[PDB]
Design goal:
The structure is a homopentamer.
Chain A lengths: L2 H22 L1
Bound molecules: (hydroxyethyloxy)tri(ethyloxy)octane (2 copies).
PDB class: de novo protein
Keywords: De Novo Design, Membrane protein, helical bundle, DE novo protein
Assembly: pentameric
C-alpha cells in the first residue's frame, strides 16, 4: 500500500530528528 | 487507524523541531 | 477527521522550520 | 480538499529544508 | 494522484534530513 510507506517514512523522519538532536546536544 | 498514526508521528516531529529550535536559540 | 489535525501539525512544522531558517540566518 | 494542502505544506517543508541545507553548506 | 506526490515529498524530506545528519557529523 501507500499509507504504510507514509507511516514508515514519518518514522524515519522521527529517527533522523532524534539523531539531529543527539548531534546538536 | 492510519490517520491516527500519522497525527502522532507529526506530533513527535513537532516536539523534536521545538527541541531543535531551543537548542539553536 | 484527522486530516485537520494533520494540516495543523504540518503548519506548525512549517512555522518551526521557518524559525530554524531565521535562527541559522542570524 | 485537504490532500492538496497537505501536498503544498510538504512542498514548502522541502523548500525550507533545502534552505537549511544551503545555509549550512 | 496526490498520495504519490506525498510519498515523493516525504522521501525527499528523508533524503534531506539524511544530508543534514551527514553534514552535522
Ligand atoms: C517538484 C520537483 C519535480 C518532481 C515532480 C514529482 C515527480 C514524481 O511524482 C509524480 C507523482 O505523480
Ligand atoms: C538529497 C541530497 C541533498 C544534498 C544537498 C546538496 C545541495 C547542493 O546544491 C547546492 C547548490 O547551490 C550552489 C551553492 O552556491
Amino acid at each position: 500500500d501507500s499509507l504504510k510507506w507514509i507511516v514508515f517514512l514519518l518514522f524515519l523522519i522521527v529517527l533522523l530528528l532524534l539523531a539531529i538532536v543527539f548531534l546538536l546536544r
